[PDB]
Structure formats: C-alpha cells, structure tokens
Coordinates of C-alpha atoms and ligand atoms in Angstrom, one line a residue:
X4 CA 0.0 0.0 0.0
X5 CA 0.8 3.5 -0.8
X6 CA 1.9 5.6 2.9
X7 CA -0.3 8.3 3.8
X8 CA 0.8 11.6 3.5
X9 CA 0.7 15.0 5.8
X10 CA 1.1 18.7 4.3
X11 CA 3.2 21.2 6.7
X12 CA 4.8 24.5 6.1
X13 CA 8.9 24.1 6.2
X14 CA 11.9 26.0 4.8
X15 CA 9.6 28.5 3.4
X16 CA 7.9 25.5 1.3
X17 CA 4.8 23.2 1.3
X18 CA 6.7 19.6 2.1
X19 CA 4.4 16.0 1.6
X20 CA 6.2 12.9 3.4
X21 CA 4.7 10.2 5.1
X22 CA 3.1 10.1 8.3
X23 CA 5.5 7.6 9.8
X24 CA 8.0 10.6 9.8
X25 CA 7.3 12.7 12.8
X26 CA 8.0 16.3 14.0
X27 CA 10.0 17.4 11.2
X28 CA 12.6 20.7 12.2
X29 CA 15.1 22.5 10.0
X30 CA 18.4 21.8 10.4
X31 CA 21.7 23.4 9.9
X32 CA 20.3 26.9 9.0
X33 CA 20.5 25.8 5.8
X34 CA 23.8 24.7 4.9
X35 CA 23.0 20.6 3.7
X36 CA 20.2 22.7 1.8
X37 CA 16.9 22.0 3.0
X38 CA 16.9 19.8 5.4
X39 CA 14.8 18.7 8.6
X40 CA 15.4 16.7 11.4
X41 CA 12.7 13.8 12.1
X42 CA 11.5 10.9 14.2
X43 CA 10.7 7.7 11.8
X44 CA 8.1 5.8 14.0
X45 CA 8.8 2.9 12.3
X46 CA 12.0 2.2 12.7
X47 CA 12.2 4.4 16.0
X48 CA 15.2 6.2 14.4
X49 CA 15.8 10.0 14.3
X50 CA 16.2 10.9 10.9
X51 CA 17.3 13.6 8.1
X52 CA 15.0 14.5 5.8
X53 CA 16.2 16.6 2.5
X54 CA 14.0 18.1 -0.3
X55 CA 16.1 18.3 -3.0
X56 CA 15.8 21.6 -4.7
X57 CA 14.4 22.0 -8.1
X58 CA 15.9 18.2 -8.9
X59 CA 14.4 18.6 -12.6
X60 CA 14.5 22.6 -13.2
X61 CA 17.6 21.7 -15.9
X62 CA 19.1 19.0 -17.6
X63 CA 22.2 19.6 -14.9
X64 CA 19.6 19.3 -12.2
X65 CA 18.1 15.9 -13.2
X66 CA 21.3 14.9 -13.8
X67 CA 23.1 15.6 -10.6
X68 CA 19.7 14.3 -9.0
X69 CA 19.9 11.0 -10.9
X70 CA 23.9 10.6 -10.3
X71 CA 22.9 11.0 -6.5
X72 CA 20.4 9.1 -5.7
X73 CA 21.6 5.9 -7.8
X74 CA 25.4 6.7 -6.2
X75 CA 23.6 6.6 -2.3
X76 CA 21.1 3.6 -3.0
X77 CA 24.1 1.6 -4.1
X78 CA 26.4 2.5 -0.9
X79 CA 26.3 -0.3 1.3
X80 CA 29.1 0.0 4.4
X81 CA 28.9 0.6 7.6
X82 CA 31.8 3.5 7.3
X83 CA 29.4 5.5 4.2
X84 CA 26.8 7.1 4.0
X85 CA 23.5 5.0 3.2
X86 CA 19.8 6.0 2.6
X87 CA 17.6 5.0 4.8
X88 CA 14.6 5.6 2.5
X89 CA 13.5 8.2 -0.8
X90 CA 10.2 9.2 -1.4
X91 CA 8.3 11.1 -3.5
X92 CA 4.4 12.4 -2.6
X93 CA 4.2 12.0 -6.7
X94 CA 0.9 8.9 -7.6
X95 CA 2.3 8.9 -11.0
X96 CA 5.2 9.9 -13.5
X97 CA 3.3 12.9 -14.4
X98 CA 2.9 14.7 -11.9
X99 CA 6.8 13.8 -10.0
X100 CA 8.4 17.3 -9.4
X101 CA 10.0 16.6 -5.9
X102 CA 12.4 13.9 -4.4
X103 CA 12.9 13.6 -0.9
X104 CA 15.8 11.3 0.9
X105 CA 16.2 10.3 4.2
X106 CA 19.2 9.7 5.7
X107 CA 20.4 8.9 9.6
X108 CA 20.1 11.8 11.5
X109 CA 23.9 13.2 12.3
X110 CA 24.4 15.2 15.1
X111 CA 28.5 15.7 14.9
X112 CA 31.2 15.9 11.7
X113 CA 34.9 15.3 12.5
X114 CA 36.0 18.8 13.6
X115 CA 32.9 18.6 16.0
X116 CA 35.5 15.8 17.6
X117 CA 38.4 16.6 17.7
X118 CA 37.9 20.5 18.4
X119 CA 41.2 22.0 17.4
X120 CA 42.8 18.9 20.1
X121 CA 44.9 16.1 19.8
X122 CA 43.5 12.8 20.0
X123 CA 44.8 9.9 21.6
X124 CA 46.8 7.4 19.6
X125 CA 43.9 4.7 20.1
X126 CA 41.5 7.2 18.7
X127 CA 43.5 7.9 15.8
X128 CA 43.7 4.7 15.2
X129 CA 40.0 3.9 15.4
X130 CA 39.0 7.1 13.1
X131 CA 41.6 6.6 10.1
X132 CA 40.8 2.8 10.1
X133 CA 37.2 3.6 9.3
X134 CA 38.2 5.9 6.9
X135 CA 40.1 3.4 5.2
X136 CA 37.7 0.9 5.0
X137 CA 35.1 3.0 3.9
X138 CA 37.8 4.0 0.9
X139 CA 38.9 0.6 0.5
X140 CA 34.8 -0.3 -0.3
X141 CA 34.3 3.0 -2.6
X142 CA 37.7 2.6 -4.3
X143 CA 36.5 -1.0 -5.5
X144 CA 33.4 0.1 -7.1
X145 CA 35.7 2.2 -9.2
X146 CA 34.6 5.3 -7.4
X147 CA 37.1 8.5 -6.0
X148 CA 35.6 10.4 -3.6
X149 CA 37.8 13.6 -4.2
X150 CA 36.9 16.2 -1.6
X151 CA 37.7 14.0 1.5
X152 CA 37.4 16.2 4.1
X153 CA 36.4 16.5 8.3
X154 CA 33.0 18.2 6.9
X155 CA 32.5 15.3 5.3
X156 CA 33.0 12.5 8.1
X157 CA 30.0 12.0 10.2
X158 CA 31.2 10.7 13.5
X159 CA 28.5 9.6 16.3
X160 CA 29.1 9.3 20.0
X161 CA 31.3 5.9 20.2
X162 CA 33.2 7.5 17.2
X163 CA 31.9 5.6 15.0
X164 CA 32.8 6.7 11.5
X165 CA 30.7 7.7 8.2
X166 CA 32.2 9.1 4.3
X167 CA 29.6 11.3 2.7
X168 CA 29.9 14.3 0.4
X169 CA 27.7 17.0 1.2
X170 CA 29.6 19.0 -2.3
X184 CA 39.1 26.4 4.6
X185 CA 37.8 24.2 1.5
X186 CA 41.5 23.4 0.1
X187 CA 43.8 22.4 2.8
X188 CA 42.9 18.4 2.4
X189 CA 42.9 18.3 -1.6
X190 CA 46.1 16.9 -3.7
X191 CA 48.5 18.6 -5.1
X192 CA 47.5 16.8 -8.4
X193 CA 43.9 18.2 -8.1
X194 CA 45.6 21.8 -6.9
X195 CA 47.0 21.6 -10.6
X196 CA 44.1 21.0 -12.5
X197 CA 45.9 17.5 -13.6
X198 CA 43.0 15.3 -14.8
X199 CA 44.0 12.0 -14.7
X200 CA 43.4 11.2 -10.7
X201 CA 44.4 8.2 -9.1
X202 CA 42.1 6.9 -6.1
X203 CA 45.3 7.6 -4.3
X204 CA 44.1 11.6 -4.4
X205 CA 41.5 10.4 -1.9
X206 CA 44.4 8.5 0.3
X207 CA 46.6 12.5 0.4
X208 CA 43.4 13.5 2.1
X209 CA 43.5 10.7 4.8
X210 CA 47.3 11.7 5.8
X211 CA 45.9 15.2 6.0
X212 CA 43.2 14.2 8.0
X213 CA 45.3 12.1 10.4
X214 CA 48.6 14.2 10.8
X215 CA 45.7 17.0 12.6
X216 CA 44.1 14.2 14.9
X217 CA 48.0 13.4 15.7
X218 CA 48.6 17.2 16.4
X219 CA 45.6 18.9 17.0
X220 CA 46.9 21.2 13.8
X221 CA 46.0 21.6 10.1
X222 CA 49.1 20.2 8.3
X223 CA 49.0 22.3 5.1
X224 CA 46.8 25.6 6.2
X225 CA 47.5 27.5 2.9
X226 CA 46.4 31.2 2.8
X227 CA 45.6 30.8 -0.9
X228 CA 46.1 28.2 -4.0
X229 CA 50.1 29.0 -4.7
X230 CA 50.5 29.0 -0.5
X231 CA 49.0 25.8 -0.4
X232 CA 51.8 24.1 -2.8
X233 CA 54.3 26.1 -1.4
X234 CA 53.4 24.4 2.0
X235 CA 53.2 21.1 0.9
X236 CA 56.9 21.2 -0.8
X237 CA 58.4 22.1 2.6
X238 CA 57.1 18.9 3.9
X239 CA 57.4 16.1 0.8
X240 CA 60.4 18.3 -0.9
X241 CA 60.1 19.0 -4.4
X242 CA 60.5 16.6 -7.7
X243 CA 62.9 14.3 -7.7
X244 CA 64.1 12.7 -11.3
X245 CA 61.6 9.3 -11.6
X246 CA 58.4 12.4 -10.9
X247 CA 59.8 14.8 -13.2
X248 CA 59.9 12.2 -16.3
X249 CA 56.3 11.9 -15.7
X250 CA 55.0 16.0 -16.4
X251 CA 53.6 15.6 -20.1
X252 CA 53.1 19.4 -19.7
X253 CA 56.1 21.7 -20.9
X254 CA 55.5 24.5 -19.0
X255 CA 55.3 22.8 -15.7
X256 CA 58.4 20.8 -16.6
X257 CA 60.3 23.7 -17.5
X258 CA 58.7 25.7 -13.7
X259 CA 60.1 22.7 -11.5
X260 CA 63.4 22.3 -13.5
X261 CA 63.7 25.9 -12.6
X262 CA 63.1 25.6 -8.9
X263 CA 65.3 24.9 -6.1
X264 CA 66.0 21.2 -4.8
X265 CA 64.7 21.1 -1.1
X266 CA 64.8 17.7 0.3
X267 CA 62.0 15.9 1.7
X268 CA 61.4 16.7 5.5
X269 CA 62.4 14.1 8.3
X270 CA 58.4 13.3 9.0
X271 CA 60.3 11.8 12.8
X272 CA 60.6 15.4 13.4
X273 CA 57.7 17.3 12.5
X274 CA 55.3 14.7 14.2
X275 CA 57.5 14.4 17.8
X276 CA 56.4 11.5 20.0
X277 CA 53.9 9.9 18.0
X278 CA 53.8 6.6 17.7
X279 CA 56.4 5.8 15.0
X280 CA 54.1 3.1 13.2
X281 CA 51.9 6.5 12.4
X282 CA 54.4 8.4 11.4
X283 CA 55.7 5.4 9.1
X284 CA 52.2 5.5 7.6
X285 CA 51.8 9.4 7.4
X286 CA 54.9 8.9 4.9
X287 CA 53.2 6.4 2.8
X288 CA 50.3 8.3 2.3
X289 CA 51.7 11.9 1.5
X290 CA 54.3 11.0 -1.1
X291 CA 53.9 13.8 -3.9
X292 CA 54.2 10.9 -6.7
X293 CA 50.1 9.7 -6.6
X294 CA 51.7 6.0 -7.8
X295 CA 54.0 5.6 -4.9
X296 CA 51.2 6.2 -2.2
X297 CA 49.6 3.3 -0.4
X298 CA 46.4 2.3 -1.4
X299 CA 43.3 2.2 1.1
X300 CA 43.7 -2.0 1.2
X301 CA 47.6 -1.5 1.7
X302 CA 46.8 1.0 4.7
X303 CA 44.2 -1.1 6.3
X304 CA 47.2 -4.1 6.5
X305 CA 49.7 -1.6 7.9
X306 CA 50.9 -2.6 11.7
X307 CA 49.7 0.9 12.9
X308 CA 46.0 -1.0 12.7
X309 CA 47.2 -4.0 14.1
X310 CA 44.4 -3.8 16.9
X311 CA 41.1 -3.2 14.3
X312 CA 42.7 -5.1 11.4
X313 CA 40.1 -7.7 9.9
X314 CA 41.1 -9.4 6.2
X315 CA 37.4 -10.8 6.6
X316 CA 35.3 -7.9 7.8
X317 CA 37.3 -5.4 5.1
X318 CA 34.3 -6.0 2.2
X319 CA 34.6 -4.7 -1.4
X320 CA 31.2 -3.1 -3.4
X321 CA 29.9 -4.1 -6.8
X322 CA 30.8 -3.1 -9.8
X323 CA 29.5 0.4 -10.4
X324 CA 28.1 1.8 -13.7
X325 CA 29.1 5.4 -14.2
X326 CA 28.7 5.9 -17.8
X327 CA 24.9 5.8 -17.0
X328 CA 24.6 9.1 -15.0
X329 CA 27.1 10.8 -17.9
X330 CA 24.2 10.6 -20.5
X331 CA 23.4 13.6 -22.6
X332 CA 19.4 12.9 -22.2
X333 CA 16.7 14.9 -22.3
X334 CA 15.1 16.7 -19.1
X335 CA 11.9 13.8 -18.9
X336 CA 14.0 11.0 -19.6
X337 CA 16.1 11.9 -16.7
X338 CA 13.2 12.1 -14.9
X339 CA 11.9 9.2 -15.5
X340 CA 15.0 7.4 -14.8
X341 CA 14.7 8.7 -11.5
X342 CA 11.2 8.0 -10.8
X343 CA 11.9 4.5 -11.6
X344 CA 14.6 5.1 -9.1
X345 CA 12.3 5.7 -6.5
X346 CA 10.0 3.3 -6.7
X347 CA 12.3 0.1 -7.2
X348 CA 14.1 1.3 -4.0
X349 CA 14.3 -1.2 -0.8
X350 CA 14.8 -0.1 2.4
X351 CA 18.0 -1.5 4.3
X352 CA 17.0 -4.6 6.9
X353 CA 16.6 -3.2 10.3
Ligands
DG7_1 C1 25.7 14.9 -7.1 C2 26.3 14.0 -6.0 C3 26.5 12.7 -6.2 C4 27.0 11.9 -5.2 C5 27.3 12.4 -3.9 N1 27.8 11.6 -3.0 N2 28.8 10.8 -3.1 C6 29.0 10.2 -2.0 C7 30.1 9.1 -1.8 C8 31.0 9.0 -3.0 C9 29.4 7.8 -1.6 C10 31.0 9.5 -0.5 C11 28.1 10.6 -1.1 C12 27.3 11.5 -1.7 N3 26.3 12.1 -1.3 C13 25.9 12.3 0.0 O1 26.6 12.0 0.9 N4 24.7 13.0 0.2 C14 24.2 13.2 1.4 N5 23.0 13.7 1.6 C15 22.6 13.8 2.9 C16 21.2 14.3 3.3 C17 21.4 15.7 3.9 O2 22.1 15.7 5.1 C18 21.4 15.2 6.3 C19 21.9 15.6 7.6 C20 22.4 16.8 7.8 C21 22.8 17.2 9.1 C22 22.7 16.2 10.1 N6 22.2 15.0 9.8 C23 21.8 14.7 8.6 C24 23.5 13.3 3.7 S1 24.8 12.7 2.9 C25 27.1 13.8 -3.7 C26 26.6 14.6 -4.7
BOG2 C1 55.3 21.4 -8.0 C2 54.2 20.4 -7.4 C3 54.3 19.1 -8.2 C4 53.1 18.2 -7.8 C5 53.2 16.9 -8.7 C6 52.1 15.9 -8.3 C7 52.3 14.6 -9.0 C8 51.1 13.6 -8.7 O1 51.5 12.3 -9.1 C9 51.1 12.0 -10.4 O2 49.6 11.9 -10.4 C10 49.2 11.8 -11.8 C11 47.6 12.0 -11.7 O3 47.1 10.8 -11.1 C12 49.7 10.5 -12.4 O4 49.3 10.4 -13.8 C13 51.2 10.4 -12.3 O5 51.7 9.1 -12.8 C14 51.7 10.7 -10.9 O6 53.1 10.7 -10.9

C-alpha cells in the first residue's frame, strides 16, 4: 500500500512525506540545503529529511539528481553514508516534481570531535581505520571520492565513522587536483586521509595555505620538491620547465615534524603523503599496515559491486532523466533493520 501523506509549512515551502515521519525541524540553517530533522516511527530512528531543490529545473539538475540518488542507493558500508529511504508524494510519473531522501540523523562531523585537540593514539587509530575501510569499499566500485574532508565524516558518540559528500575548502585536496591534472588516481583520496590524520595526531592543520600558490608552497616544505623518476612523468612543458627551474629542497624528516607519536603513524603518514600519486599506499595497503594492528580484519574489510558510471554521464533529455529517477524511486528497498 501506498503511505499516507501530511502537508506542513517548512523552509519556506509546502513539504508532503509520510506520516511515519514525525516532527519534522530545519536543520543546519541551511547549509546541507533544505533539510529537517525527524523521528521515523517505524524504525524508532531519528532521521534527516532533505528536499532536494528544483531536482528537474535543468538537464544539470536531473542529472546531478539522478547521479545522486543511484550513487547513495548503491552505498552499502557501515563507514558510508546509506539511505535509509527516498520518497516522492508523486501517484504517477506525471505529476513527479520533488524527491525527498532520508538519511540517519547526524548530530556531529569530524572537527565537531576533535575540536582543534589532539587525540589519543587509540582514537586515531580507530578514526583513520574507518576511513580506510570505507575508501577501500568506494575505491573497489571504481569510485574517488575527491573532496575527503572532516566536513565530510560524520562521527557519532562511540566514534563511529561515516564518508559522505555533502559537495578552509583546500587544505585536504592533492596537489594533483591543486594543478588541474586530470588523470586522478584513487590515491588523491588517500593524500586527504594523511591530511586528516597528521591534525588528529597534532591537533593542527598540516598544510593551512592562505591561498592556491601557498597551499603548494606548503606542501613542498614537507614532501620536498620533484625528484628525477616524478619529473619524467610532467607531459606538460610548461610545468616541466617551472620545476626544473626551482630549487632542490629535500623531503622533510616526518620523525621530526610529528614528535612523539607513535612511529608506526608516522611510518604510515609517509606512505600516504608522497607527492608521486603512484608511490602512495592504497586504502587495502593501509588497512594491512601494523599501525591497525588492533582493528585489522582481512574478513570484515568487504569490497562493493561493480558500479556503472557511464549511466549518470548521459546527454538525455530533461523527462528521460526524470523518468530514470522516478523508476529510481520506486524500485528502491529499504535496508534490513
Ligand atoms: C551529485 C552528488 C553525487 C554523489 C554524492 N555523494 N557521493 C557520496 C560518496 C562518494 C558515496 C561518498 C556521497 C554522496 N552524497 C551524499 O553523501 N549525500 C548526502 N545527503 C545527505 C542528506 C542531507 O544531510 C542530512 C543531515 C544533515 C545534518 C545532520 N544530519 C543529517 C546526507 S549525505 C554527492 C553529490
Ligand atoms: C610542484 C608540485 C608538483 C606536484 C606533482 C604531483 C604529482 C602527482 O603524481 C602523479 O599523479 C598523476 C595523476 O594521477 C599520475 O598520472 C602520475 O603518474 C603521478 O606521478
């Protein structure tokens, strides 16, 4: 049976959702959009609720709306984000203008838990292994996640560990992406994670550029500049020619920039922020790395399905896209309890 539906004022807009959804609040001002916190009776969750806005105003729209809502229906991992159901108020194809997901309610990000502080070496460990098996499972369905960030880790009360992408903003991004480069490795994602853990080891932003060219300058200082085997690999001229021109600084004794951590982090922290993208560990390297010797779990480390992308990089028309995504909708299952 189809639910039945309540009408209520929110965000300035009429929303529809079913009734099992209770007491529905805005959330975050409006920063994840429009979004409001909920009770699901059914479940006896507290929930997210978000009306995506104008999801088939443009082709770009029902694009990004289809790319989205396929992406999140086929996350299944404990360490990403998952949807907990999508709904439309919609009886039919024609008259589908709205899309609403529903999500876990999240009431802290990573910077909401470490708070400028350093963490304890246990906790570090605990954080950047959930990280890295959340990467491990994206990085198999063929997927980079790109802007890994602490905005985008949702971390509960036992610290346990979420990867979303809700899409200052620069200081976790590779230098590879800082220079427009194009042909990313899933190792961009893995930069991000040493970023991430060298501040939950100090309480400090490693890199905390001012602008673009301070951001590269910074990260020089620490992983030196190009040696020989990197600079054979610049296909572009001009950037070849820049680097040639610079002067050789040599990589920074990582011992001594991270004092009296544990030296199995700091042994990682170099595998993970080496300026060549092929010489980084990969997310199933990390997770075997001694460092995790008290979380590691070869049989609890799963992998995802294949994952189609060439699907959501369609040029369609407006309806088809909406259809897509109303069939979307209505073929979706709800996890198991
Ligand atoms: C176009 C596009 C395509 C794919 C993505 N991706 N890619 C990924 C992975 C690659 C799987 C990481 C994940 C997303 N997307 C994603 O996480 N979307 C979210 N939507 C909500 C609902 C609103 O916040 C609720 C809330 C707010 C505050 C408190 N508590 C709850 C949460 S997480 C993004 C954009
Ligand atoms: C002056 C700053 C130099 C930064 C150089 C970053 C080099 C990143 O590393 C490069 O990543 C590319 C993209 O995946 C790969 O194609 C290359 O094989 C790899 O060497």
């Amino acid at each position: 049976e189809r639910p039945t539906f309540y009408r209520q004022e929110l965000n300035k807009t009429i929303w529809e959702v079913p009734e099992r959804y209770q007491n529905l609040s805005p959330v975050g001002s409006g920063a994840y959009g429009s979004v409001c916190a909920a009770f699901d009776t059914k479940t006896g969750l507290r929930v997210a609720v978000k009306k995506l806005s104008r999801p088939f105003q443009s082709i770009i729209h029902a694009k990004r709306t289809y790319r989205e809502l396929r992406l999140l229906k086929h996350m299944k991992h404990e360490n990403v984000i998952g949807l907990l159901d999508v709904f439309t108020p919609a009886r039919s194809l024609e008259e589908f203008n709205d899309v609403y997901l529903v999500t876990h309610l999240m009431g802290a990000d990573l910077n909401n838990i470490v708070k400028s502080q350093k963490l304890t070496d246990d906790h570090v460990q605990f954080l950047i292994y959930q990280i890295l098996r959340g990467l491990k499972y994206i990085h198999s369905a063929d997927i980079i996640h790109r802007d890994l960030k602490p905005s985008n880790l949702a971390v509960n009360e036992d610290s346990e560990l979420k990867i979303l992408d809700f899409g200052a903003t620069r200081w976790y991004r590779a230098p590879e992406i800082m220079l427009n480069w194009m042909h990313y490795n899933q190792t961009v994602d893995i930069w991000s994670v040493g970023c991430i853990m060298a501040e939950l080891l100090t309480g400090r932003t490693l890199f905390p550029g001012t602008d673009h060219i301070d951001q590269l300058k910074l990260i020089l200082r620490l992983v030196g500049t190009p040696g020989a085997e990197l600079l054979k690999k610049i296909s572009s001229e001009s950037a070849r020619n820049y680097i040639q021109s610079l002067t050789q600084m040599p990589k920074m004794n990582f011992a001594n920039v991270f004092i009296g951590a544990n030296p199995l982090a700091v042994d990682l922290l170099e595998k993970m922020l080496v300026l060549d993208s092929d010489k980084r560990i990969t997310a199933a390297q990390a997770l075997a790395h001694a460092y995790f010797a008290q979380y590691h779990d070869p049989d609890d480390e799963p992998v995802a399905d294949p994952y189609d992308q060439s699907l959501e990089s369609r040029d369609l028309l407006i309806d088809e896209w909406k259809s897509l995504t109303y069939d979307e909708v209505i073929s979706f299952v709800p996890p198991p309890l």
